Amino acid sequence: MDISEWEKRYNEAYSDISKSLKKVKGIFVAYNSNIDAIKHIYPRQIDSPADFVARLIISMRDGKAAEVPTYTTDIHEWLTDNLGFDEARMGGQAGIISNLLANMGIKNVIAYVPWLSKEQAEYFVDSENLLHPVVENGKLELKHPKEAYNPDNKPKVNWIIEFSKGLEVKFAIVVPRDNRLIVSSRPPWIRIDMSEELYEHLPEIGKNIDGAILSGYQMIKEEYEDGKTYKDYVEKAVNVIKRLKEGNPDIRIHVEFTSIQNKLIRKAILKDIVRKHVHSLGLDTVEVANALNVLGYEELAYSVIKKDENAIVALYEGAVILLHELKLERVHVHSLGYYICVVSKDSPVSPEDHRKSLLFASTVAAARALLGNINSLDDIEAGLDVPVSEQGYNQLEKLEKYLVRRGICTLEDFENGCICTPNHDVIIIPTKVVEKPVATVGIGDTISAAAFVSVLAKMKKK
Ligand SMILES: Nc1ncnc2c1ncn2[C@@H]1O[C@H](COP(=O)(O)OP(=O)(O)S)[C@@H](O)[C@H]1O
């Protein structure tokens, strides 16, 4: 059943997208930057080490990627001496995406972070593509991160413990698949916010860009020390989105969702700031269930997190509901062997061009695995040598047999990757997976970011 024509679709997509990546004016990427600390190997937050080991055991028996936060530096000095990290890389949704797009030659990459530190600026690439906004003397100044940063700000470091093959140790029992645990520092001084002056010059920033990639809203707490609610930061998160559209009407705005422990913050994010002011959303199989658990579809959410064969068809239905419940124009869910992107019929980009974006995003993710990171637009070309994962092609077979028997799409339509339903459209591709990747943090942000910028390029709104 496996047709070798898919290798031809990847090749003709890379050249067509790379030749269009000059059509984008700029991108605005904001709110998430930290320094990862990779360590080589029911509690809701980490206050004492007994909680850290407990949350590690959950990841050791499910193989699920769980992100849990710490608020005090009481355990920063705990691990830093008891357990030495071996590598420190650029981390955060906005940070990785800022480096990726700059390394791709995307023009006018505008990266903003509230906590910009002296140690943090050294991790950003040095190029005319990547610039940070500082509003000094009442006017908009886009200066390099190396220089326009605040000295009083101290860095934000996160601990990442990753492991594979499930090397087991019994205490007083083997990890199924590869899994990583993220211990994120959320000190009281970091806030998802921006200066009042930079909040004023947002129409200027929007007029010189074509898209915005926003992520990091999980830093918002319910209660603050200065007596401010999560609704204010939720309100400000929208008004920043609003003022960007006031300088550009045709700007598309993407939000890269992430695992959020607090369901009340998770729901307030999906309902108050993503529902109507956002067009694009990026997810993974586990976050779709997370999104359903707050919108009111837990039966389907449990079906997504379940292990049966019909879990993928639940992931399909989960993506469709997220596209309609949230009034979204695009939903990009990325899995290990395949991508699933459901798109509205209002989409300013045809389903034919939606496929090339996913094929390109799949080409970028493979090169991201082989090379430590990507340094040029031509480096992505290396990603075409990774073979298409047959496991991903066979996972779609369970979904294909379910869709052609339901009567939604044609057998021809699925083998090509373009399904046209009466109210929405779906694009499905098998991705390219490396047996021995070099680094596996950031691959997710890279898929949605590379796919999102490829859409703005091929947009006829130019
Ligand atoms: N070897 C390899 N080769 C190609 N592509 C890969 C590979 N490994 C993973 N992937 C992708 O990473 C995604 C996880 O991103 P996720 O959002 O879950 O993680 P982060 O938020 O840390 S970037 C997963 O859905 C896969 O499509």
Ligand SMILES: O=P(O)(O)OC[C@H]1O[C@](O)(CO)[C@@H](O)[C@@H]1O
């Ligand atoms: O929510 P936080 O603490 O910024 O962590 C975001 C995580 O996402 C990553 O960018 C991986 O996608 C890591 O660098 C980081 O651990």
Ligand SMILES: [Mg+2]
């Ligand atoms: Mg992710």
